[PDB]
């Protein structure tokens, strides 16, 4: 009868819903706005209601690169998630949360203290996001490439558990690609700058952009014809056009130099991540490269990786890049499934346990 | 306090098969071993006796071509959990319909059988 709540926190978007559901019922931006300096102020706004009041608000992202940086704001996000979005009392439901890889032990405890002390939950569990994605793909062993709005991660997983020594971080993600698109569109005179104009450009990116199988060759053939050119209707009613920017933009994932970064591309970062793993399992990693996150939704991305990795890997090594259509919510879906299992009923951290052991209990109960 | 099927798991040498039914691990009738629903997901544990008295474990989670995501993910998780319950001494295997390893198919003398249909999704 009584199902549990599942929340996948993100640098840009929150995914919340109920276990047993095949998808999250609520998806809103991880933004918190407060007055910069009369009546129902109110005091603090969240999500879409905050973006609809930019004029009198100093907006902030509680999570930065997959990591919480403001707990006062993080607590506000969760409040809105429970009472305004889900319409469910936290004290009446278990709560499955997600966390980035290499999440400091301090944040795990803090996130636990809040759930029990502030929202008075009966139960709680925390899971690594990428591990949930692999589970949703129906795998116990594989390497996940999670790329969202604020951070990208490659994390090898073997028999259910991840390998921290081989996990690689990358401060290149969708928001950087958004900012990059705004920059190159000045080659057409289009002057997008405002935080409002940043959201419309974000849509152009998600609608028109695609991964070129061969960048140098794609650039040549695209310059000749006009089929590359696509139109996009601005919300005012004006119509602009976009051409090679469609694959120049998401190319920063493979060539961070376009953004002014000495970092390595995702194909190379995925390669190095696997190389750090024991030899006896590399085959299973190469043959189960799973994608998750919205930034991995670009058309023709698997075709690029599948061929770019083969260039680096042994000639004999079979390579399969998996691109599930639902991979925008693959993390959440993994949570929904896991927290629905008959066996998980005794893996929860209970209230009794917290009162007896405190926030430090999360380290021993969650992996 | 703990899942009865886990308590049954890997105690005697032989072959155990469970099917995922609505976010739960259910035993398959012994007289239906070898017959898999293409629309479901199964968990298989082969137990072998060693010279030193200990038991060897191999965990194969089988995924039908028409199985739903909740079933496929549950099988995976169940495999990890059953592996941990067995002190992690079990080797995990992902078996997809049509690409089953020789080891897996070799478990069945009369051969692997496919059947259409299956239990409904937990979604
Ligand atoms: N169809 C699409 N094509 C390309 N990019 C997309 C598409 N849909 C969404 N995105 C991008 O994916 C990002 C959102 O992904 P997600 O919701 O996983 O972010 P997140 O979970 O907050 O990121 P993080 O990994 O930092 O937590 C946005 O930056 C958005 O621009
Ligand atoms: Ca994310
Ligand atoms: Ca089924
Ligand atoms: Ca094991």
Author numbering:
A (entry chain A): 5 to 41, 47 to 376
B (entry chain G): 27 to 149
The authors write:
Malaria parasites have two actin isoforms, which are among the most divergent within the actin family that comprises highly conserved proteins, essential in all eukaryotic cells. In Plasmodium, actin is indispensable for motility and, thus, the infectivity of the deadly parasite. Plasmodium actin I is abundant and expressed throughout the life cycle of the parasite, whereas actin II is present only in the gametocytes and mosquito stages, including sporozoites, the highly motile form of the parasite, transmitted to the vertebrate by the mosquito. Although Plasmodium lacks a gelsolin homolog, the mammalian G1 is bound between subdomains 1 and 3 in both Plasmodium actins, similarly to other actin–G1 complexes.
Because of the observed differences in sequence, conformation, and helical symmetry between Plasmodium and canonical actins and the importance of the D-loop-mediated contacts for polymerization, we constructed a chimera, in which the entire D-loop of actin I was replaced with that of α-actin. A chimeric actin I mutant that forms long filaments in vitro also rescues gametogenesis in parasites lacking actin II. To further characterize the filaments formed by the actin I–α-actin chimera, we analyzed electron cryo-micrographs of JAS-stabilized chimera filaments and subjected them to the same classification and symmetry analysis. Based on the determined half-pitch distance and the symmetry analysis, we conclude that the symmetry parameters of the chimera filaments are in close agreement with the wild-type actin I filaments. Therefore, the symmetry parameters appear to be retained from the wild-type actin I, and thus, the D-loop of canonical actin merely confers increased filament stability. The D-loop in the chimera is slightly more ordered. Yet, the sequence of the α-actin D-loop alone is sufficient to restore the ability of actin I to form long filaments, without altering the symmetry compared to the JAS-stabilized wild-type actin I filaments. By generating transgenic parasites expressing the actin I–α-actin chimera, we found that this mutant protein was able to function almost as well as actin II in vivo. This strongly confirms the in vitro experiments and supports the notion that the D-loop has a significant role in determining the polymerization properties of the parasite actins.
